[PDB]
Symmetry: D2
């Protein structure tokens, strides 16, 4: 005897967990990203312009910060996320700036990886599809095999029109697994000026890493966030497979070309594929 | 071990209970409100215009259907709700119509009854504040006295300018308690063309009704639960007076008509109009 | 992720909720039963001996206080309960006194009302089956008709031999519903010397009382919750007849005395004695 | 609106989770131990007799199987566990055999590691205290440091009278961690004739192993059980510390003397300490 079904709202009632002490701290986290690094912007703009990208799909746009840059830089952006809770902030921003012609043109919609094909509006499909900030790692492997990772990837891939780009990244889980730590301050896209401590939890199921759970401490309060530990060799194969190997594929480590065995260990691997 | 804290989202992940069978059926419920009845529109519009209301605050605006009407009729509307889940549909609509001047001027924001004074923007406060559709009954009495009902009301009241209206209703809980049924099809504002069954659950705590919970089945057969505080007429009226310090004129309608104690016709909803003096 | 499945124990680990604040206060409640009133003993012993009862089945025996009396008075008692948590105290007692011949002969076993026929050992079935202290009211009506009440009763009935008694009671739910209070200090079997406050919660589903839940505070101030099905007198009586196919004699006591409809004195408990014919 | 507080029972009502599909399968597990191995009995009896043990405390006795043997072999046994749910089976057995003088004399009681000193009845304290079958591993480290392991051990230690034995064991977590598997069929005390599959989950917190969770499949149904991963070097130190190093201490691997670096890898380490 819950008083309302899980997931139903009520006029003038806060949705189920809005008021919780973890939420009102999680919103500090979701919004401490207000400091794009110079090196990131220079790289992304550089790559999209080099390949002649005009219409861009930004998947898992979150508060839309990456999208907002693209809109400002002259691109034709549609931005999607599954989370209403975060999409709300992008939608807000668009609205304040609804008066600027670029922002009138900015398309923001709900979409889920698992049904991406039905969700997104376009015809032709995009010049580039970007999925940056390690968002793909959010997707759990509940099934057991990786049948959800395969389907999500093939849906994102399908968004890429012949000669177009998929630009997608993962935190260096190779390094994470071997040290057993996901330390703070390592975002290459946005730098935080927030002090944090992180507890790293690695879950190994039947001798295969299966989840990395981060317990953040940041006025002092706790939130939890969880990740699928994508290893470089494996993620690469997953990406190829989404295209049927009809793609060229290169690997960056922190925006610079990556060579197996190099001495510098990157915080993130960034995969750029062009559909052939 | 939860893999994420309750109430935290993840880029590219549905928020906690979005895909549950009760949710994707609740959205069917919450978008039934699509057939405003003729005499509702004619009464509301008539009252606002009788008292010269221009600036209107719509509290718990839900998908914003009542607000959308007001904007379409020329009013200066601001619309609030605590539920992001619902405010989503209103914001959507405004966006589609952002091209019509009236909709550019429509203000939509997050607010909670418990902090309404801080939350809403304005100076100095509305011609009329409308809270209709029985939303106030959504607010539970967790603390046990009715201390929360007192504060909410007092906050809504405070939005009302000198000379202004508070327009606020309740389903007829007197009738509900005495027959122990809150049956379907009774909405006087929007008529459903959806078939439903309702189970009605009345909770009495130490001899005072404390909660009415409704378990809907809707016709693909699916279920959801929604809960209410049972505001009786004599009580709610006192509560409303108290929100104004009695410095108000108050009258009671039953289904849009003047209501008289002991009349034979039993109204589905009581609707309270108060003017601040 | 739970670290162990719900309901599995671990060598050297307390079972799931043993150390919770409500448990270690519930045990204070469940061992209040330590002051049998004089007129209870005198009525029970009197009835059993009037009808020549030797072999007795005590159903929901809890800590076994009623059973311990019967054994001490010379009866052939078997005692059952579904709750391991409670059966623990009875088993303990038997063990301490395992040296007295009467206690060597006392049978104590696990049984569930839903399967009572399979569960209890015997051939051919008891002189009297006693289920007293309002335990039957513990059984919820989850399925909605009273199908479970029917089966339980029918199972208990089946334990009764030709010529035998079923002795079974209910707190007076008629009174409870009509005043909306189940107040403390009313036990006619055991008197507490413990101070308590009770909150009474009545759940009505589609116009039929479906549950009474009691939230106790006990005087170190601690809280626990316990729930009951509200058996009304007219109804429970029909249910009991039906368990025997009407092939039974039935009478109703109010607090150990013959009960007559419309009398002025309002009993705390109704106690039903039925003899199989 | 739970209808009754968590952990309260009701005359003629099954305690909270008794009826669950995991429980009625867990009882198959708790009772598939009806086949003591010959080698175990020969070792334990041998050791207790060698040191002249008469009064024995069996901690975490579970269904009492080890205790029942001791009672049958002539010892003065008191047997304790925290779990009513399992203690119930020992108590049962005693009762059926209450007629045999040895079983009249058998003391069975409730006790918790954390308060063992107050819980157990004795004066002098025991000739040997046995905690076998890997039960100590059941005790989680919720605190974070190992302050509960330290207190439990010092309580068990305190049960041992001058010149007496603590005999206590752990599954080989060294091996478990390094292979990432806790496979079935490896009990050296009791052999199962039950077919099982096990999923092994290792949880590493801040680079220190913290939990091993076993999901059993055994008519096919699932239960879960969890363990603290005690490593040999560390557990040894913990045991010494419980005595203040005023103890001699040897290590067996599967009942045979254990030598660091030997080629045979044991399933269990068994610690025998004598208080000096
Ligand atoms: Cl107007
Ligand atoms: Cl007798």
């Amino acid at each position: 005897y819950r008083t309302r079904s899980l997931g139903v709202a009520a006029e003038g009632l806060p949705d189920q967990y809005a008021d919780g002490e973890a939420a009102r701290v999680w919103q500090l986290y979701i919004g401490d990203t207000r400091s794009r690094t110079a090196e990131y912007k220079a790289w992304l703009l550089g790559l999209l312009r080099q390949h002649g990208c005009q219409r861009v799909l930004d998947v898992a746009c979150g508060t839309g910060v990456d999208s907002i840059m693209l809109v400002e830089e002259g691109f034709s952006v549609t931005s999607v996320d599954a989370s209403d809770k975060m999409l709300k902030y992008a939608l807000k921003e668009r609205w304040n700036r609804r008066h600027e012609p670029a922002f009138d043109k900015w398309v923001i919609e709900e979409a889920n990886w698992m049904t991406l094909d039905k969700d997104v509006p376009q015809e032709g499909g995009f010049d580039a599809v970007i999925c940056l900030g390690n968002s793909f790692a959010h997707l759990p492997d509940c099934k057991g095999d990786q049948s959800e990772h395969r389907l999500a990837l093939k849906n994102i891939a399908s968004m890429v029109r012949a000669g177009g780009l998929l630009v997608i990244d993962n935190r260096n889980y190779d390094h994470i697994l071997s040290t057993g730590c996901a330390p703070p301050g390592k975002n290459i896209y946005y730098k935080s000026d927030l002090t944090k401590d992180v507890t790293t939890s690695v879950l190994i199921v039947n001798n295969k890493a299966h989840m990395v759970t981060l317990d953040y401490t940041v006025g002092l309060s706790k939130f939890r966030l969880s990740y699928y530990p994508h290893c470089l060799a494996s993620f690469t194969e997953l990406l190829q497979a989404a295209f049927g190997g009809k793609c060229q594929h290169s690997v960056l480590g922190d925006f610079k070309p990556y060579k197996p065995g190099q001495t510098y260990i990157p915080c993130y691997f960034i995969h750029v594929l062009k559909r052939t």
